[PDB]
Amino acid sequence: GIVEQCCTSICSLYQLENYCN
Amino acid sequence: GIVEQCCTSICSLYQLENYCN
Amino acid sequence: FVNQHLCGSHLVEALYLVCGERGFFYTXK
Amino acid sequence: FVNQHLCGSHLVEALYLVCGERGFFYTXK
Ligand code: NA
Ligand code: NA
């Protein structure tokens, strides 16, 4: 999930936008 | 939506929890 | 902190604090 | 601001800024 991709690893715009509506 | 209930009117815990998963 | 007008990042912050491990959905508006 | 470790309210803040009027969903974990 987003915590694994952005908190415990380095986040990216690409990944953040996966969680936009 | 949440903006109508919490931003342009006074928010409540009751309403906030409607938007928890 | 919840019983006031909450807009933008202020509203997102309240959802974060209240919902905890449940998570939440936010849509503007 | 997005290319770093982002946790808790820091992550929620990034979603808020990036997603804009689209809104977003956040779940911890
Ligand atoms: Na609290
Ligand atoms: Na920006």
Q: Which of C17, C13, C6, C9 is nearest to B12 (CA)?
A: C6
Task: Assess contact for D18 and A16: CB atoms under 8 A.
Answer: yes
> Which H/E stretch holds residue C28?
none
Structural contact between residues D23 and C28, judged by C-beta atoms closer than 8 angstroms: yes
The C-alpha atoms of residue A10 and residue D4 are separated, in whole angstroms, by 5
- Is B21 in contact with C25 (Cβ distance < 8 A)? yes
Tell me the C-alpha to C-alpha distance, in Å, between residue C14 and each of A9, C1, C20, D15, D20: 25, 7, 10, 15, 17
PDB resolution in Å: 1.3
* Domain ranges, residue D13: 1-28
CB contact under 8 A, C15 and B20: yes
* Separation of alpha carbons A1 and C25, rounded Å: 15
Q: How many domains does chain C have?
A: 1
Q: For residue B3, give the nearest of D3, D12, C11, D25 by alpha carbon.
A: C11
Inter-chain touch C27–B9, beta carbons under 8 Å: no
Whether chain A has a CB inside 8 Å of the CB on D1: the answer is no
Ligand 2 centroid, distance to D18 Cα (angstroms): 6
